[PDB]
Amino acid sequence: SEKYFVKNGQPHFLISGEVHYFRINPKLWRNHLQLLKQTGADTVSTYIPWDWHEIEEDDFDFEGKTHPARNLIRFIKLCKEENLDLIVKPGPYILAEYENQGLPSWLLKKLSKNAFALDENGNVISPDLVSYLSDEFLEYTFKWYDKVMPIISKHQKEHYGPITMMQLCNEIGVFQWLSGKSDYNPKVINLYKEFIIQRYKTIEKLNSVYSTNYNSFDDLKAPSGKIKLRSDYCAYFDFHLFFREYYNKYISILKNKIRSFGINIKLTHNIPGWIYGNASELPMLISTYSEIMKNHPDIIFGLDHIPEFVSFRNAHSDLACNKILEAMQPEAPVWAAEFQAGTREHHVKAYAKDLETFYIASLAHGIKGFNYYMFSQGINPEGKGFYGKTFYFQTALDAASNKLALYDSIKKVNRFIRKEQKDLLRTNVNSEICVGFYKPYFFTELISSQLLKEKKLNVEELGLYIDPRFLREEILFNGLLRGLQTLNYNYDVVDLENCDLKSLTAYKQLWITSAEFMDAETQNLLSEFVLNGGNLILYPAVPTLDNYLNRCEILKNNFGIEFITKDSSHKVSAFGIEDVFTAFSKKQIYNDTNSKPIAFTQENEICGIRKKIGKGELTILGFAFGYTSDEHLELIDKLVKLNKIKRELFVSDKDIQFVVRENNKSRYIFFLNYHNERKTFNYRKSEEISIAPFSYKVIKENK
Amino acid sequence: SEKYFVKNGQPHFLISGEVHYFRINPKLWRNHLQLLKQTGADTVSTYIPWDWHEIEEDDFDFEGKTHPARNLIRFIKLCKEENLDLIVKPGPYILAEYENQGLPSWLLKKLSKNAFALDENGNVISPDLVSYLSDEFLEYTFKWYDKVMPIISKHQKEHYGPITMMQLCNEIGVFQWLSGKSDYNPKVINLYKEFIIQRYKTIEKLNSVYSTNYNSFDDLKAPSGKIKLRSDYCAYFDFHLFFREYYNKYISILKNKIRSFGINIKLTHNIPGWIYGNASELPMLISTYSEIMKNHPDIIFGLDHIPEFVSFRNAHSDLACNKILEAMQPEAPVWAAEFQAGTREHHVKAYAKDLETFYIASLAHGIKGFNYYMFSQGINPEGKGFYGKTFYFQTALDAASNKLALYDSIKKVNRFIRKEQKDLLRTNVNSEICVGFYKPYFFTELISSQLLKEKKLNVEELGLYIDPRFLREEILFNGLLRGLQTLNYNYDVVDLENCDLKSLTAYKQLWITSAEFMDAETQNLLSEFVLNGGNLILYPAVPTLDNYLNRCEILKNNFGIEFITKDSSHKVSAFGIEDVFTAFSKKQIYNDTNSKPIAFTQENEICGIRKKIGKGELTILGFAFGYTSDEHLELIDKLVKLNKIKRELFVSDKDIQFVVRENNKSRYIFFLNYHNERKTFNYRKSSKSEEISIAPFSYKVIKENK
Ligand SMILES: O=c1ccc2cc(O[C@@H]3O[C@H](CO)[C@@H](O)[C@H](O)[C@H]3O)c(O)cc2o1
Ligand SMILES: [Ca+2]
Secondary structure, three states: OOOOEEEOOEEEOEEEEEOOHHHOOHHHHHHHHHHHHOOOOOEEEEEOOHHHHEEEOOEEOOOOOOOHHHOHHHHHHHHHHOOOEEEEEOOOOOOOOEHHHHOOHHHHHHOOHHHEOEOOOOOEOOOOOEOOOOHHHHHHHHHHHHHHHHHHHHHEHHHOOOEEEEEOOOOOOHHHHHHOOOOOOHHHHHHHHHHHHHHHOOHHHHHHHHOOOOOOHHHOOOOOOOOOOHHHHHHHHHHHHHHHHHHHHHHHHHHHHHHOOOOOOEEEEEEOOOEOOEOOOHHHHHHOOHHHHHHOOOEEEEEEEOOOOOOOOOHHHHHHHHHHHHHHOOOOOOOEEEEEOOEOOOOOOOOHHHHHHHHHHHHHOOOOEEEEEOOEOEEOOOOOEOOOOEEOEOOOEOOOOOEOHHHHHHHHHHHHHHHHHHHHOOOEOOOOEEEEEOHHHHOOOOOOOOOOOOOOOOHHHHOOOOOHHHHHHHHHHHHHHHHHHHOOOOEEEEEOOOOOHHHHOOOOEEEEEEOOEOOHHHHHHHHHHHHOOOEEEEEEOOOOEOOOOOEOOHHHHHOOOOEEEEEOOOEEEEOOEEEEEOOOOEEEEEOOOOOEEEEEOOOOOEEEEEEEEOOEEEEEEOOOOOOOOHHHHHHHHHHHHOOOOOOOEEEOOOOOEEEEEEOOOEEEEEEEEOOOOOEEEEEEEOOEEEEOOOEEEEEEEEO | OOOOOEEOOEEOOEEEEEOOHHHOOHHHHHHHHHHHHOOOOOEEEEEOOHHHHEEEOOEEOOOOOOOHHHOHHHHHHHHHHOOOEEEEEOOOOOOOOEHHHHOOHHHHHHOOHHHEOEOOOOOEOOOOOEOOOOHHHHHHHHHHHHHHHHHHHHOEHHHOOOEEEEEOOOOOOHHHHHHOOOOOOHHHHHHHHHHHHHHHOOHHHHHHHHOOOOOOHHHOOOOOOOOOOHHHHHHHHHHHHHHHHHHHHHHHHHHHHHHOOOOOOEEEEEEOOOEOOEOOOHHHHHHOOHHHHHHOOOEEEEEEEOOOOOOOOOHHHHHHHHHHHHHHOOOOOOOEEEEEOOEOOOOOOOOHHHHHHHHHHHHHOOOOEEEEEOOEOEEOOOOOEOOOOEEOEOOOEOOOOOEOHHHHHHHHHHHHHHHHHHHHOOOEOOOOEEEEEOHHHHOOOOOOOOOOOOOOOOHHHHOOOOOHHHHHHHHHHHHHHHHHHHOOOOEEEEEOOOOOHHHHOOOOEEEEEOOOEOOHHHHHHHHHHHHOOOEEEEEOOOOOEOOOOOEOOHHHHHOOOOEEEEEOOOEEEEOOEEEEEOOOOEEEEEOOOOOEEEEEEOOOOEEEEEEEEOOEEEEEEOOOOOOOOHHHHHHHHHHHHOOOOOOOEEEOOOOOEEEEEEOOOEEEEEEEEOOOOOEEEEEEEOOOOEEEEEOOOEEEEEEEEO
16 A cells, blocks of 8 residues: 555665765765665765766766766766665756755856846746757757766666656756746747637636636737736636746657757656745645646656744644645655755754654654765855855764764664655555645636735635645634644545545544635535535535635535625634634634534534534634644544544653554554653653653554 | 942842742742742842733723732732832833733733724734824723832832832844734824924935925835835835834833833833844844933843753854844943743743853853743733743743753752852953944834845846845855854943944954945044054945935045946955855955955956055955954954954864953853763863863853962
């Protein structure tokens, strides 16, 4: 049942370290590789920067003719001699704080205007930022591929070489995220128009969905500025769909070109989204790759985990991210393409004793492999660094291969992992709770994000009150998922799109965090789930609209629900818990015919009910709670206990986190202390131990 | 010349703990007070909530007639019996996670729409957010003061009662700030128009400053919407000046009212600004009090410190904030009206081991008194909790008066303070560095802040490139102040407004973080400073405009500087440090006339120079750096060393922070480890070496008898 990497026909925990040959004294390349191998790592990972090797137009140095650190061939030879497998990342974009994000200076200098990403007035957004589908950009990308891909093809694992995986480009769409700006290049806007025509077929069909009054597709303009009308929301929704298709077209073009060289190894891509040590935005970035993950089951996405510290402030971020990637990519191991080792930023400290705890927590939270980023510090060669001379700090090795404090922490965790990987990789948690991932609530990188300065989405202007980013960040990510983890209840996440009914029926509860809109397909799925015997928990809204904010009340009518939306005090009572703080004045007040009232406003109006529908059970709460009080944990606990779900252990200290992982034969109990307190506690199944601050203990049980 | 509190003509460390009588079983009041007293605390602090005591309109209970916990009189009497002095805070706002932020439900239901803070469209910003100078709001506030102020007056120290201090309202402007919108109530609009007419006298004079073409004052309205023209910036600048007069008017009205009851005790106010465990916007909020602090020498402002954790991530916020309070309030002790104890929110943990280090760090960083907030947990009665039933967590005492882990940390810190206060309160750090606090860079709460919904200020639209909020957050607060503290260089902060030349001349260096604009008075002061023998470090810009973005080239002309603004790579070299990352493409390029060039762009153009001018020294850097790379610390270290400024100690681990405080008798060495690493290091005075082991997120204090 578990997905994991394999080596010598056994489960293999992928332990990779990032070592940028182009940023390291070549005399010390062998020393870095030997010190990496000596931690128990099996793989090394690096960019092959286009700028670094195509030194002028059609002048390629991969052999150190012009600088010894351009000798990629020798670095590959060294990986073979030191028995490390190799992950290569030739771009064209590599980011990695490399000048021009890895694109050559000579290329950016001579590309025409129409090869760049353009704002809505036709201005170049950034002198570094090309349009992914520019004919000029792809012509030169292909000329770089023509030189680097034969080297990669020769050394690929399919030819018994060291190269086991290759990453295509780097964090596709990351520049649209960080800026909030879409590419309005006329070639992108022409592709958008093809996508719309393809989708709706006739202007009359589009007009009926958008409530527009176009006489033809020729009157359709790309959306821009703030959303004022429901028709602007609709246009922006399809603009988000279009960019997911667009990224799939871009990665497909790169993939087909790579395959043309007989490169048959595993291809990868990498998911950004951590900011200031939390990852509540990362599911939005995952959502931008929905079409890639649909269309390319041979491309493994990995996570970019950047926790910065390890505490209760961010304990829930890595688990939520791991569970969501598993939802969206169930057929591949969950792995970290970039797994924090040291720090990108000198002033943002990464302590060995914090990261060691993060690495063990990552095992507890289901990670199957990772690439320490950065294992080795780098020195930017002559003016190639976008920032200072130094690339990363507090790594395992400095740029001169001096061992730093993190080295011994990585050796200790790698030793544990190698000892256990055969059993540990084959263990799972027993989840009786399933949490729905409704991808359309996440499709907002152009209109509403933590990085977007000025919000283009203001739902009040559309006659709505539940903002999908507030819901997915505060009610879902920082609320339910944080609460379940804190309470030590296992959950799984499931992608609701084209979702198997049979795959929901394993779980004793399905939790849906719902806004006022939800497509017919998901409303029908949830209707069938309950009617066939499923237990659904749904809040803060029974949806009444589809993704285009057109009437859709399938779930409401199937469940015999009637409500009025009414203003009350933020505080409600729910299952006899008084003073539950809720996010909104506006609540759904339910007709209680054939229902049990279980929640009440300050004026005693019914804002939550339970009822039987066919063979199943429904719990609807017409109010939004996250986790910002002890009453919120008490409510999540009451709701889980409605279907008699139990924790795997009794632990005497409720602030100790545990994860029980098992298979037929083996059990691992991971105890995690996310607090600045020495804790002493005991445990028993549904026995006394001391854990230092910000630390861990792993217990093995034979079954 | 330290500022500290005095009791019986002796130095006295103010130690208060916050104990909310209205959230504690009255049968347990005495036990809370005794346990606070047993920590060596001398004072207890509480709100008196309007909503709690005016139970219906004109129905008052301070005696526990309708609920035992309304017996304010008994609580006051117990404070006296248990030998604690008492800070009272009767509002009208208390915030304090109390329903409607302390305002009665019956009041907010009764008030007409014009009692409320209104947005640009005339809509109510929040149903518990009043407009401060609303006629209706102040009428009911006065009727609340009519009943609570005679009790406070009767129980003052001078009448042998326990009351020594009273807070006026609570964090003026904090609710407006968190709302993300400013108040456009018609009272604000009308008071603004009067302010503009008083300021400019004629529409011609206003048109000449703004470059507008108004026919009369009747054509001008309070500015709304984004700044697109320099005239819109001018309008908003006067709107910011107006709001400082407005907050002074509010607190003057409360103060004059309080004084009419024969209340002669010390009045206080409390400074907000911490959010998510840093305080980079606190200087903006304290800036909104500029007119209060000039007009009321008898109101002492204290800080509300909420660090939430204690690490290098937020190490610099408390020192910066303490230094900025001292700059604005130089004649009163630096103290914390609210000093974090436990956590206001269950999901944001407050660890005893963190807060104990915060308490010692605060002493290192010159705090002279504090009120542990919250010393005692509360339970909200009768649904009064804004966010839940429980008020605070991981406090010194739970609501029942059981000791929690933090109790022992507070007893340890208090014991050290009581043993040492007579010397400690009289100690100084030796600061050879002065950093200028230019208040108008902070006057952006209407147009640019971390909390404001709308970005109204885009300097590029104005032909500018140095955003004042970017400068003051990243180049000053998180940049220079963070770097000096990390490098263990003592600094003082000095308010440049009406600044005495003589108060700047004691320092070896004066550091000015400058935008492209600065008023004539400040340009002149910095000119005179250097000409008379001061050493000035100025970056990232020689200013050329005044506060209204009109021509002012006084400092440029007085220092004999010629420059062109030119685009280049973000990276410069400075004093032989290569690949120093700077915030802007645009840099000031200086010619080398009568100067030593000491920084260069990627094209080897001069973007930094040093020169002698009259008796003084000038170092200008035409580029912006904060602290986002090792090169920045190297650069700050080099600039400090230009005047042979030395650290107090040689310490073997550069990541150990230290503060040496001394007087004639006594030296205290504070070591602070803001890192998750057990550190073993040696040290020595810059005039054999001592070895120290320090736990993660921990401290040592050495005392020496001189
Ligand atoms: O609707 C409201 C009104 C007031 C209000 C005050 C609150 O507290 C303030 O929070 C600031 C930010 O962290 C601090 O700078 C300040 O010192 C605190 O007094 C709060 O948490 C929530 C609130 O919600
Ligand atoms: Ca019904």
